[PDB]
Design a protein around this ligand. Structure first.
Ligand SMILES: Nc1ncnc2c1ncn2[C@@H]1O[C@H](CSCC[C@H](N)C(=O)O)[C@@H](O)[C@H]1O
Ligand SMILES: Nc1ncnc2c1ncn2[C@@H]1O[C@H](CSCC[C@H](N)C(=O)O)[C@@H](O)[C@H]1O
Ligand SMILES: O=c1[nH]c(=O)c2ncn([C@H]3O[C@H](CO)[C@@H](O)[C@H]3O)c2[nH]1
Ligand SMILES: O=c1[nH]c(=O)c2ncn([C@H]3O[C@H](CO)[C@@H](O)[C@H]3O)c2[nH]1
Lengths: 344, 344
């Protein structure tokens, strides 16, 4: 589709390009760590696999990373694609036949040696039997909380005026509520997924993290500005904004690390941050290209609260704010890659 | 949908009713055979899981059979649903949330202790790592061959006149070509799925098998009659019929057993045959109900060779032939259940 996630990735390919060498070194160390039955079958999942061409590009990179180490007879790889229950697994599955052909042709890997299946559900709950997995990988998912912060939901709400998440501009109780939820969720994710890994198993996480720059503007800041424009210009109802809170938290790298250390199950092997500028994969209606990217992510949740009607409007104003920031290199996400090993 | 598989099962529920006590005794013996890590996690697959309410009813029956033995803390069950790449896994996945709630409510099984995933692909090729599974279950799937018999395809065709499969009325070379393909395919299924099972792991297969009765008429015979009606009455081309061969074989119970013994990987623990009359689930346009059941299964393949147009006509004549045979109890499938243990 014209507006779909499948046709509106490609910034994601630049992220994946950064992850790749970390991934390769991560699996290199994991194959020499010699876990149970690893030279026979390696068991792997991707948590938050989504649906487009990008999902099989991650699998491709994971498989290539494992095969690269072969420099004996290739180990079987069993890969589980995880995502929520309503994800479009059907569209991924239909693409499998040609994908497996590509592997045979381009990679030397015989059909049946790479077994790709799905395990749907929340990655804040158990997905796999205790000590069954060698390697878990997640990219661009951990910003999504299990729920709107429970302080804005169970406690007594529309306390986050003019915003849709916790900015640096947000009131103290708003930041606290979002951090508390992140902390709960990430600690649960770490605990739960350590239980699934054999000892010395590994996780590789790539997450959006807080930018340092003053004047920097991420996609959520730009969205927030876009919606504020519509309330100020009479178009949107303005307690509709105050009652809208994304279930998203963008941590700081320091906050991610503290929680890993507090949780206690994982040793941190590697940590790095990197920016990707929103217009980096492009060729200045590059602002419109960015607006389409963000919409492919945020349209469903936005639509269901604000109505299908104002979305064109949201992403028109969005483009205007993007256009101001791109020429300065101020429109980006900052990112964090972290390699963990399960401690014995 | 009105014509869909999901709304056109219920004969299948009678089959499953017959399978259940065999299933139960099968898993009872399996859990005392004490395979590797079986009291911690039991790994199970349903091969040819399809898409309707029936698919989660099989899962339900498998789970209950495992929990029934607990008469210690419930083992985790990891279940893989397998079917072909284009199957509607999406629709099954959307139902999983309520299904898991049902399990917690009605079964005492806490959420996260039953992990249901999918592994798509043909069950005549490898689906799981070697010696990784405890139990595989297949019902009503083994009729379906890997291809139209290679004799009628690679060799030099339109040799099976006025038929669509191998009847007892079929010429000798037709029966030979179909039996050769069954043998190849079923042998491959056994060999391939033994390799996946731990030693002493189990398979339970429920297959359509040949009826004994003269004058008995299964759904395929009735279809064949319906199509023959249309050529004789000028409606259908009549080399369209002679070039149409289903990739379906209905074996005799003796043929299935001989192949199990020859393949040599499995010990046969239990073998039983049973009939289900096509109108058994019904409180005499019961013939129309049967015709709809059969169409839900055979419409895609019929349509793509004969055209979407004549299908109403096919199933109108079908109903007429069904109506002659149901009052006599001559419209049924005969069925075979076989319990198998992987030999050491
Ligand atoms: N709790 C959860 N469990 C599993 N998936 C989740 C989740 N919360 C969010 N997601 C999924 O996370 C995804 C973020 S987009 C996926 C990014 C992708 N891995 C890439 O690198 O390009 C969405 O598909 C969303 O549905
Ligand atoms: N080679 C193969 N691998 C996996 N599934 C197959 C297959 N050949 C046929 N099938 C599937 O087998 C199914 C038969 S209908 C399913 C019957 C179901 N198990 C029940 O008891 O009610 C179809 O869904 C078809 O798509
Ligand atoms: O804010 C988010 N949240 C996501 O899950 C997510 N997944 C991918 N992306 C990126 O989508 C665009 C790439 O086509 C890019 O602008 C990022 O916002 C995301 N941005
Ligand atoms: O010939 C087949 N082949 C099948 O795969 C199959 N799966 C289910 N059935 C049954 O479908 C009807 C039940 O609603 C019943 O008439 C059987 O044909 C099948 N009949």
């Amino acid at each position: 589709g014209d507006t779909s996630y499948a046709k509106n990735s490609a910034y994601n390919q630049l992220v994946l390009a950064k992850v790749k060498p970390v991934l390769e070194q991560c699996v290199r160390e994991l194959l020499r760590a010699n876990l149970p039955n690893i030279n026979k079958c390696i068991k792997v999942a991707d948590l938050g696999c989504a649906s487009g061409p990008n999902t099989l590009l991650t699998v491709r990179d994971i498989v290539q990373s494992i095969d690269k180490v072969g420099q004996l007879e290739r180990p079987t790889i069993q890969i589980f694609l995880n995502d929520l229950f309503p994800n479009d697994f059907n569209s991924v599955f239909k693409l499998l036949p040609s994908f497996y052909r590509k592997l045979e042709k381009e990679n030397g890997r015989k059909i049946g040696s790479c077994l790709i299946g799905a395990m749907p559900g929340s990655f804040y709950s158990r997905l796999f039997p205790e000590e069954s997995m060698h390697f878990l990988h997640s990219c661009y998912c951990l910003q999504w909380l299990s729920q709107v912060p429970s302080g804005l939901v169970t406690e007594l709400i529309g306390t986050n005026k003019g915003s849709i998440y916790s900015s640096k501009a947000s009131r103290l109780p708003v930041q606290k509520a979002y951090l508390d939820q992140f902390t709960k969720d990430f600690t649960t994710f770490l605990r739960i997924h350590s239980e699934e890994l054999f000892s010395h198993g590994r996780m590789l996480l790539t997450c959006i993290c807080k930018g340092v720059e003053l004047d920097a503007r991420n996609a959520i800041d730009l969205l927030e500005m876009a919606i504020n424009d519509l309330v100020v210009e009479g178009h949107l109802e303005e307690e509709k904004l105050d009652s809208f809170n994304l279930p998203v938290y963008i941590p700081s790298a320091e906050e991610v690390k503290c929680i890993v250390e507090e949780e206690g199950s994982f040793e941190i092997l590697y940590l790095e941050t990197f920016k990707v500028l929103y217009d980096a994969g492009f060729s200045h209606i590059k602002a419109e290209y960015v607006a389409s990217s963000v919409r492919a992510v945020y349209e469903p949740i936005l639509a269901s609260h604000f109505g299908e009607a104002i979305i064109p409007d949201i992403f028109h104003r969005f483009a205007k704010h993007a256009a101001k920031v791109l020429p300065l290199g101020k429109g980006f996400y900052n990112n964090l890659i972290i390699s963990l090993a399960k401690k014995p």
